[PDB]
Amino acid sequence: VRLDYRISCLLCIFKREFDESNSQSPGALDFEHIEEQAEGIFGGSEENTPLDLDDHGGRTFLRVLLHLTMHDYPPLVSGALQLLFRHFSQRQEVLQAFKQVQLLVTSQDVDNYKQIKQDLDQLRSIVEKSELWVYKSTSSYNYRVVKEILIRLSKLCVQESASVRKSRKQQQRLLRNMGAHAVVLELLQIPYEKAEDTKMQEIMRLAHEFLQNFCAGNQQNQALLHKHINLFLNPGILEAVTMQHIFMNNFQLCSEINERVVQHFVHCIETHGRNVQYIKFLQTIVKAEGKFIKKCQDMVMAELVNSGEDVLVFYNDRASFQTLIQMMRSERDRMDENSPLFMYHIHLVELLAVCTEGKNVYTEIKCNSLLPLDDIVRVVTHEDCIPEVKIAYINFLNHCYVDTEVEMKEIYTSNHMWKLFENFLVDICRACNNTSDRKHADSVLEKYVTEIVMSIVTTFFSSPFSDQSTTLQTRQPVFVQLLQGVFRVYHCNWLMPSQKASVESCIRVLSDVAKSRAIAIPVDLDSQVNNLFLRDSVLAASRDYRNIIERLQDIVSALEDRLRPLVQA
C-alpha cells in the first residue's frame, strides 16, 4: 500500500509539472526541480516521515525483523528476511513499479484492456505447462483455449474493413507495450512433433498469422521483430511469408540486411526446390517504398549467379520450348498450383525485371547474358503466350534493353520490334473487343494492354536516339495504326486516372515522335489529338500523451541514474 501511495504521489507531481507545459506550448521541462521534488519522499533527510512504520527511523522495525530470524520456525525466518530485503530496497522496487503502467481514456477500450489482460496471462500459463499436456482431457481444453486466444488477439488488434487490411496504431502499440510477441515467440519454438500432430500445426499457423497481423503496416513492430530474425530462418512456407510481411514497405530495414538472409534463401531454393514464396520474398526485399537499393540488387545477383542454372531455369531450347508449350495449356484457366511449375518462372522473371530497374549496369549485363533478344521475340511472338506471360516478359525486356546506362544497338536495327508492335496492336484490338462485356471482362489482359504495352513504347521512344533510327520511314502506317490503337484504348470509359494519364502521356510521346520525324498523321487523328491537348482536440491530446510518455521515460531514466548511488549506499 505504501508503494502504491508513493507511485500515486509521484505521478501527481509529474502531471502537476506538465500542467504548466500544457499551457506553455518551447516544451522543455525543468528536470532538476521534478527530480528534487520526487527524491524528497523516499527519506534520507533526517526528520523522519509518516511513512515510517515506527516513528524511530526504522530502528524498531529493523530490530523486530532481525529478532524474527533466529527462531526455529522456517516460515517465520523466510518471511522475516524477505521483509528485511524488501525494506532495504524500497526505492529501486518503486522504480520497477513505474517500469510497469499503461491505459489512457477513450471508449470500450476500458473493457478491451480487461479482456486482453488475462488472455496473455493464461497464454503464458499454458505455454509454461505446455510440456505437461503435449503429446509425446486437458489437451483438448488447452487446444481450444489457445486457439481462441490467438483468434481473439488477431481479430482485436486489426481494424477489419471490407477488403483493406487496416491496423489500429493505438492497439498495435498497446500490444507492443503489453508484450504479446515476448510470449508468441516462445510459443513458436516449443518442442513438438510433426509426424502425428495436426492441431499443433493449426495452432502454429494461427501464431504465424497473428505475428503477421502484429507487424501489418507498423514500422515499430517490424523493427522490434528484426531482433529475432535468427529464429525465422527456416525452409518452411509460413516462415517465408512472415519474413515477407515484416519486410513490406521497409526501406531502412532492407538497407541494413546482412547477406546471411539472402544466401539462406538461395540455399533453401537449391535444396528444397523452387518455390514461389522465396521469389516473392526476394521481390519484397529488393525494392522497398518505391526505392531500389543498389547493394540489394548486387547481392541478390551475386547469389543467383553463384547458384547458377539450378535456380535459374530457362526454357530456351526447342526441346524445353515444346514442353513449355504443352505445359501452358495445363497452366490455362485459374490453375496456379501455388508453388511449382510455371508461376515460379513468372515470379523469377518479375524478379529479374525489378532487379534490372535503375540503370544498373551490373544487373543489366547479367540479364542480357542470361536471356537473348532472339529468345525474347520467339517467346512473345508465339500465339500460345498468354497475358500472364506477356506482362512480366515485356516488362523485363523494356527494363533490360531500353532503360540502360549503356545502350545496345541490336534492339535499334532489327525488324522484330515491328512484329512486337503488331502483336501489341492485336492485343489492343482484343482489349477493345473485350470492352463490350464489362461484367466478364478479362481484367489481366486489359491491365497488360493499358500499362505495359504503352509503357515499353514510351520508354523506347523517350531516348533521343530512337528518332535518329530511320527504320520507321518504311513502316509509317504501322506507327499510325499503333497510335490509333492507343487512342482507341483511350476511348474506353473504364480508364483509371493512372491508366488515363499513362495513355495520354504515351499519345503525347507518339505525337512528339511524329513531329520529329515529320509523319503526316490522319486529319481526324490530328484534330482529336489537338483537341485533347487543348479530429481537432482528440489528436492533439494523443500527441501530447505521446510526448508525455517520452518525457516520463526520460524522467525515470534520470531518477534511476541518480538513485543508483543511493541504491548502492
Binding site: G44, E46, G57, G58, R59, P565, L566, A569
Partner: peptide
C-alpha cells in the same frame, strides 16, 4: 568533468550511508 560528477555521487552515497548508520545504530560513543 566526469571525475567531478563521480566524486559528487561518491560523497552523496557516503553521506547517505553515514546518516543511515547513525539513524539505525544511534548515538554510540
Amino acid at each position: 568533468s566526469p571525475p567531478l560528477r563521480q566524486l559528487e555521487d561518491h560523497k552523496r552515497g557516503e553521506a547517505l550511508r553515514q546518516i543511515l548508520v547513525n539513524r539505525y545504530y544511534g548515538n554510540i560513543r
